[PDB]
Amino acid sequence: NIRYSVPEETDKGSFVGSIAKDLGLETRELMERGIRIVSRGRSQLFSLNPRSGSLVTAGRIDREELCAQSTPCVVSFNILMEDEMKLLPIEVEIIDINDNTPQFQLEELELKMSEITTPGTRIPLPLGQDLDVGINSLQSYQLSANPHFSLDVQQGPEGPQQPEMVLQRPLDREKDAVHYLVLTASDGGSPIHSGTLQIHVQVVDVNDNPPAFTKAEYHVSVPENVPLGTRLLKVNATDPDEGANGRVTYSFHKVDHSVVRKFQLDAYTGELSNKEPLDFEEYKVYPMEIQAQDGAGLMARAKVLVTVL
Amino acid sequence: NIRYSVPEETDKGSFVGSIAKDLGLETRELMERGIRIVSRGRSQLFSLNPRSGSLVTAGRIDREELCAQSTPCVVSFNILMEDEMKLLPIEVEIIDINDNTPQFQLEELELKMSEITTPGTRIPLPLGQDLDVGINSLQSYQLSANPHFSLDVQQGPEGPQQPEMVLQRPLDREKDAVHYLVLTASDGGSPIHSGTLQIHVQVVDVNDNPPAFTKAEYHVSVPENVPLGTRLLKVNATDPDEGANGRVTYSFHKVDHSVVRKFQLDAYTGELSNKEPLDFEEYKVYPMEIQAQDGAGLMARAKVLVTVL
Ligand SMILES: [Ca+2]
Ligand SMILES: [Ca+2]
Ligand SMILES: [Ca+2]
Ligand SMILES: [Ca+2]
Ligand SMILES: [Ca+2]
Ligand SMILES: [Ca+2]
Ligand SMILES: [Ca+2]
Ligand SMILES: [Ca+2]
Ligand SMILES: [Ca+2]
Ligand SMILES: [Ca+2]
Ligand SMILES: [Ca+2]
Ligand SMILES: [Ca+2]
């Protein structure tokens, strides 16, 4: 029984072996014995010269196409020697080369995660798959260096399995609204081939910031005979949350209504105006507690102090 | 100068004092010199008998109406003795009684607070006001027992000032969506009068719970010749948050698409069905990672394991 080897993907006409050598035959000996390949299966991948006895490749030999994930990859055929009517079994092993990179089944993974997601939360990652075999197949995964997420991997029989992205440090949309990461999947060839997956994490807002007034206290001095409806003051509060969570409206806290009833606070603009006459007497000052509310139940406070001159 | 006292709110005709007694005059004496009140200001609150010399009340005497918050409350007038044409100055002090309860300027305070509100957060409360004076006016505030809120009060000169409600234990809308409390404002009378304010705290939802599947693993065994479109399994996840925060949808995690592509998972109902033929050989089992997402970026995981018989 005769066994040869050849790497996949050689150029057509690449040398595989000499039948005459391995039968110990010369030129005249070889021809008189009338050798030829019996056509079957993939035998047409090889060409036998009946004068010299050389066996060469005849066409593209792709181990991935022939054998996929099976090992080893052997092409079998008979050589017929017409003289003695004897069949000679030939085996050629097709050697895997590293001509495939680990592939993901998508290019970009889009994730949405609340900024309040608890550390330890685990998300399973798309698998990398390498068409090569053995050392040339998938050997490892790598997640790009970053402060919030790390990679976890189960070390299985033939390689790594079930990659997961695990949250380590808390997210914060007010610091980073989006995170971009890269997952690579590498084989064990030399050099190593690495496939790539882009990961996009969108951080979903939580109402986790109260508004904040520009000042703890707003002082205003107003004329004794100021007309009704006069703008006295504009207050303002900012809020870093998103949408309704960061949208603030203004109002009086309900404390002493007999004071606050003399005034008007625009819920949207924060403009404070007098609604009723103000006395220089009876009340030198007029302290009032005000409130800034966002759209989802967080609040801030300030004091307004109106002095009549 | 002659000084008498009388409590406010006595019945008409109540005794205040005897002018004859304090002038040391008898019947014939008193009459001959011809006494009478000189009408001015609040003198009509009193009636003088010109024969007996008694001074009594003539109508309702309300100290709040006469003197409000000022102290003391004295009604002054002259008595004319027509004989000597001499003016006699009389003072009657009106004694405060505790006939007013501390009042709030509203019946119910409605507050909205996120369940994520930071403990230590302070809210100023409506003021109580008592029309009486001294010991009979506002002396203290009380907040009904509750584990989430305490009352803070400033002890000022004449009474308690600036009551505040302070958050102590974190809120949790999934435990209590609302809290009802009572603020009382009391005077120092005997017995004490107490005014009452109802407080209604509405707890605003935060997405602070992920969904949770009914099981960590769903196993199903299916016949080799199961028709395409067969309902195989219904998964379910619950979520205690409110509205969108608790509304869950179902999907496959992106792991091995070559497996998951053979199936269909309804995003709303959680019904899993087969979409492509299943192989008894190519895949004995079919493990799949599934996901439940709420409407605001939290998620839970489970596994589905499909075996072909
Ligand atoms: Ca190949
Ligand atoms: Ca290969
Ligand atoms: Ca490879
Ligand atoms: Ca944040
Ligand atoms: Ca906010
Ligand atoms: Ca936020
Ligand atoms: Ca009274
Ligand atoms: Ca009172
Ligand atoms: Ca009174
Ligand atoms: Ca909660
Ligand atoms: Ca939720
Ligand atoms: Ca909640």
Side-chain angles (χ1 to χ4, degrees), chain A residues 269-286:
Chain A
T269 66
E271 283 179 282
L272 179 76
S273 53
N274 62 312
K275 200 167 44 180
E276 303 176 352
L278 310 173
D279 317 279
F280 173 71
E281 311 179 345
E282 174 197 320
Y283 278 88
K284 180 222 303 179
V285 284
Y286 289 83

Side-chain angles (χ1 to χ4, degrees), chain B:
Chain B
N1 184 93
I2 288 180
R3 161 74 67 99
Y4 303 124
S5 288
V6 65
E8 57 168 332
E9 314 285 3
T10 61
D11 293 324
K12 173 181 159 58
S14 292
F15 186 74
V16 175
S18 163
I19 294 308
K21 187 191 180 300
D22 302 315
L23 296 194
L25 309 174
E26 296 187 342
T27 283
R28 191 203 319 97
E29 274 182 320
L30 188 70
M31 294 208 65
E32 292 177 355
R33 63 174 46 181
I35 69 170
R36 56 177 206 87
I37 291 177
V38 173
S39 190
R40 65 108 162 177
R42 292 317 210 114
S43 62
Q44 310 90 7
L45 290 168
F46 301 95
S47 177
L48 170 73
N49 186 307
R51 290 169 301 281
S52 74
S54 53
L55 190 72
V56 308
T57 68
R60 185 185 173 197
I61 307 178
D62 171 22
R63 193 212 64 79
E64 277 68 59
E65 178 194 335
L66 297 171
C67 289
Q69 282 307 287
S70 55
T71 289
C73 195
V74 175
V75 175
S76 294
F77 56 89
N78 294 310
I79 284 175
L80 174 52
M81 300 175 291
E82 309 179 22
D83 218 323
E84 328 94 31
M85 275 307 300
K86 168 183 165 182
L87 282 179
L88 198 73
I90 290 84
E91 294 172 358
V92 180
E93 174 181 11
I94 314 301
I95 307 301
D96 184 42
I97 72 175
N98 196 31
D99 51 341
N100 294 278
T101 302
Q103 297 300 300
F104 293 95
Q105 290 172 82
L106 75 167
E107 295 183 315
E108 177 160 341
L109 178 66
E110 293 189 28
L111 304 174
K112 292 175 183 302
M113 303 181 78
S114 178
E115 56 177 329
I116 204 180
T117 302
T118 311
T121 294
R122 308 186 152 246
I123 299 177
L125 291 170
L127 303 189
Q129 165 188 322
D130 194 307
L131 298 180
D132 300 320
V133 289
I135 194 56
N136 295 325
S137 56
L138 182 64
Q139 301 301 320
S140 62
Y141 291 94
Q142 300 81 214
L143 184 67
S144 51
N146 179 296
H148 293 275
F149 302 96
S150 63
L151 176 70
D152 206 352
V153 177
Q154 302 300 311
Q155 300 295 349
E158 284 181 334
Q161 291 174 351
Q162 307 151 31
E164 296 179 285
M165 186 147 96
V166 189
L167 181 66
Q168 300 298 335
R169 174 200 294 176
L171 302 171
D172 178 10
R173 200 210 61 89
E174 284 70 53
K175 177 104 177 300
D176 298 295
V178 185
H179 301 273
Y180 299 103
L181 302 93
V182 180
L183 178 78
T184 52
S186 315
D187 61 30
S190 43
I192 287 161
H193 292 184
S194 292
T196 78
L197 170 73
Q198 304 290 327
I199 302 166
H200 162 36
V201 180
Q202 184 175 319
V203 180
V204 182
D205 189 50
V206 169
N207 191 28
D208 57 339
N209 297 266
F213 278 102
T214 58
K215 309 176 65 188
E217 295 194 345
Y218 298 86
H219 294 100
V220 72
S221 304
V222 72
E224 46 191 343
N225 63 338
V226 55
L228 307 169
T230 302
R231 174 201 157 279
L232 301 178
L233 168 69
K234 188 189 180 299
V235 302
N236 182 70
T238 53
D239 189 318
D241 296 311
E242 176 176 24
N245 300 332
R247 184 166 313 122
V248 305
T249 51
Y250 307 97
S251 63
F252 292 105
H253 267 305
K254 306 192 176 178
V255 176
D256 184 355
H257 188 71
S258 78
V259 171
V260 153
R261 69 181 263 110
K262 302 188 176 188
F263 301 89
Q264 178 69 39
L265 182 49
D266 190 278
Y268 305 100
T269 66
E271 283 178 282
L272 178 76
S273 54
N274 59 313
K275 202 168 44 179
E276 302 178 350
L278 310 173
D279 319 279
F280 176 71
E281 310 180 344
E282 174 195 320
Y283 282 95
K284 177 220 162 186
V285 315
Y286 288 83
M288 305 178 282
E289 299 280 343
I290 66 176
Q291 171 189 225
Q293 289 177 297
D294 65 28
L298 295 180
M299 53 179 291
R301 295 173 52 182
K303 302 187 190 69
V304 176
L305 299 92
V306 182
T307 298
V308 176
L309 300 172

